[PDB]
Amino acid sequence: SDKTEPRNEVYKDKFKNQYNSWHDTAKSEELVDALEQDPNMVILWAGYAFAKDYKAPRGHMYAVTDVRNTLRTGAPKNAEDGPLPMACWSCKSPDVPRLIEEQGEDGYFKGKWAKGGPEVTNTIGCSDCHEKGSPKLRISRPYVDRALDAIGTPFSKASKQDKESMVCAQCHVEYYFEKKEDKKGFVKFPWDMGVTVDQMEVYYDGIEFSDWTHALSKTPMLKAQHPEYETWKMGIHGKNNVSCVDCHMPKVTSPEGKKFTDHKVGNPFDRFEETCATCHSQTKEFLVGVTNERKAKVKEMKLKAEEQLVKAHFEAAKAWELGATEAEMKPILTDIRHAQWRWDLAIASHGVAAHAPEEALRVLGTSVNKAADARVKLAQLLAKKGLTDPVAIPDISTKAKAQAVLGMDMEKMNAEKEAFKKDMLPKWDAEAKKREATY
């Protein structure tokens, strides 16, 4: 493609520093397993991909490796096989916009993750954010323009400051797969109403969109994904237009004394001076530990949330057993749907505590309130079917136990995934090395 060059090596000894800082995101390679840490999430995502496996983010250099390796994507034995669609690559690779730019957007989205297997191979690279080129920014994904148009703030007409965050908005945002209406499943961002929780909620309701039917409570669910752009705008740095880049891609001096933009997107605190120091007179120990307070305040009210929702789901599990009708459970489901949605959005983004604490907290208030209604309605309903004794929740204090409780063959999935990892990945990169994309 004449506009996208996905090979990330071309621009070394050419843009020396920027390639250098970009390659140092491989480095933060810590693979924190988030279910092992909080197994409630296994039961809230009962019935659905995230029940299987969910890790915290690591560096951009692992995007492709990580999408490949994760149980959710599966072990597909051919380009027609596999639970998930092409869309999955969209935010993992600068090969995406190459496919989009030649194939067409319609030709890129059609089929399965496995189809794009061999073609989407380079990790988040230069062409993802730049008009490479040569510097200067670019959106690269047409569906992303659409979402920015949709809230009334296109890229073309933004200030230099504005854009700095939009380039991240490409991926670090809540999405869904449209609508399965023939014409999609494209990646659309639910921002037509638009970006608050709240508005996103009415959007998905109005079109009755359901991410999946919950395995226990048979509730039509929404799943939130990393709403960094949407939560940022809500935070206090957000409203001052302190961009992603100010804190995440700061300007650092070369030894020679050349000032340039750090492309190592990780912790803004490593580069403390250069990030916070720019605008704050306090110390590293102080600002660090303030954010740790927030981190812990969110964490807290977060489990509280989870604890009711887990109790809500199983309490709905028993109602169906006891003989609840479709009509009897509809409102209890709605109430659960919202509560879990508001939980999930509140914390899918790992930096919410750092970005928009207050809002993060606002929405967990909102989630518990709704979990509340859910549970008391159920309370009254289980008694009409004769049960007036609290519902027993089995031991879910471990990933394995949570995954056992839901009837999941974990020793089969991992079995199949190593097969995929050894037999099928070698065949993919092999074909990708031969493409090259050589102009």
| 54 touches ligand HEC by CB under 6 A | yes
User: In this complex, which beta carbon is closest to Ca ion, that of residue 20 or of residue 210?
Assistant: 210
Task: Specify the stretch interacting with ligand HEC by CB under 6 A; choose among 267-275, 319-327, 374-382, 411-419.
Answer: 267-275
| 3-class SS letters over 56-71 | CCCCHHHHHHHHHHCH
Which of ligand HEC, Ca ion, its own copies, none does residue 390 bind (CB under 5 to 8 Å by kind)? its own copies
Q: Name the residue whose CB lies closest to ligand HEC.
A: 351
| 223 touches Ca ion by CB under 5 A | yes
Residue 227 burial by CB count (10 A; 0-12/13-18/19+): exposed, middle or buried? buried
Which of its own copies, Ca ion, ligand HEC, none does residue 371 bind (CB under 5 to 8 Å by kind)? its own copies
Task: Specify the stretch interacting with its own copies by CB under 8 A; choose among 22-30, 232-240, 269-277, 429-437.
Answer: 232-240
To ligand HEC, the closest distance from the beta carbon of 385 in angstroms equals 37
- The angle formed by the CA atoms of residues 326, 332 and 338, to the nearest 5 degrees, is 125
DSSP for 257-275? S-EEE----S-TTTT-TTT
Sign of CA dihedral 200, 203, 206, 207: negative
What mask, x for binding its own copies by CB under 8 A, covers residues 297 to 326? x--xx--xx--x------------------
User: In this complex, which beta carbon is closest to its own copies, that of residue 147 or of residue 368?
Assistant: 368
Of the candidate residues 31, 32, 56, 236, the single one contacting its own copies (CB under 8 A)? 236
Which of ligand HEC, its own copies, Ca ion, none does residue 319 bind (CB under 5 to 8 Å by kind)? none
Q: How many CB atoms lie within 10 A of CB 258?
A: 9
Can you tell me the distance from the alpha carbon of 133 to that of 116, in angstroms, rounded to the nearest whole number? 25
| 351 touches ligand HEC by CB under 6 A | yes
Task: Specify the stretch interacting with Ca ion by CB under 5 A; choose among 95-103, 223-231, 262-270, 283-291.
Answer: 223-231
Total residues in contact with Ca ion, by rule CB under 5 A: 3
Q: Restricting to residues 149-178, which ones interact with Ca ion according to CB under 5 A?
A: 176
Q: How many CB atoms lie within 10 A of CB 161?
A: 12
Tokens representing 179 are: 């609508």
To ligand HEC, the closest distance from the beta carbon of 439 in angstroms equals 16
Give the long-range contacts of residues 372-377, CB within 8 A, separation 24 or more.
372/308, 373/335, 374/308, 374/312, 374/316, 374/332, 374/335, 374/336, 374/339, 375/308, 375/311, 375/312, 375/315, 377/331, 377/332, 377/335
374 touches 366 (CB < 8 A): no
Task: Specify the stretch interacting with Ca ion by CB under 5 A; choose among 137-145, 218-226, 289-297, 392-400.
Answer: 218-226
Mention every residue, 6+ apart, whose C-beta is less than 8 A from residue 318: 382, 387, 391
To its own copies, the closest distance from the beta carbon of 341 in angstroms equals 16
What residues line the site for its own copies (CB under 8 A)? 236, 239-240, 282, 286, 290, 294, 297, 300-301, 304-305, 308, 357-359, 361-362, 364-366, 368-369, 371-372, 375-376, 379-381, 383-384, 388-390
